[PDB]
Amino acid sequence: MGSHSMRYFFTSVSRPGRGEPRFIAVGYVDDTQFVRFDSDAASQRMEPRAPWIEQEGPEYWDGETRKVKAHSQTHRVDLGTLRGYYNQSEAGSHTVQRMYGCDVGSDWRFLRGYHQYAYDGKDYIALKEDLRSWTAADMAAQTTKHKWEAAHVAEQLRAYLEGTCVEWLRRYLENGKETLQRTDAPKTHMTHHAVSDHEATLRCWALSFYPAEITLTWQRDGEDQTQDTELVETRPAGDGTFQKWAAVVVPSGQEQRYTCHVQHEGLPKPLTLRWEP
């Protein structure tokens, strides 16, 4: 299904009162979670979250566990170094977040790579699109940039993001083809809700779709309308699909002027809904 991505997300939160940071790692192909690690879980292993990754053998899971534990230790060190770069108390909890991954096009060939790091929820340092240089947000991160340039970190990530990341993304897409290459077009319907004798709400629903990217727009007499409208954030159903709705308030009796337009990768042409009832 079109372009694809693989992305890893890592969060570490310090625990100043007792013990080591909490660490949670998750991996995604597109909008599908496929692996987790949680430092508070009993296994202390990278764990499968999708059926198509369960067939990887023990060398896979040992390697993944080793690497994700090493990430957790780096983040522990970094929490300590950053409290110091920022002159912060030992008493407070702080957060490191890292995300990296790759995109491939419809041809399943490398499109772009990324690596971003944040401290306390703000940008710290990120790899530029050329995969050769860094963006540092402040003077602490500028010292990190100089250290990472001397250590040739970007050369090593670039080789991972163009090489390994793409290669294993492609292996996952193949192995997971029954789901990962299936698009689930939105199941759409409209509801109607009389507010008073003179105004009504029309709600356009999109249900059970994958991937999560979707556009819902209202038109009146063929022109887009945003006044008197409301759009919820796209939300997970909990079965791997997504939901969204958009609504408009209209003069009762004029519902037929209004059309909902739904755009999604799973729809060869956009759908148009109208209250004809």
Partner: peptide, 10 residues
């Protein structure tokens, strides 16, 4: 597959 072997500290 995650990046390895060991991400450099800041």
């Amino acid at each position: 597959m995650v990046w390895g072997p060991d991400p450099l500290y800041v």
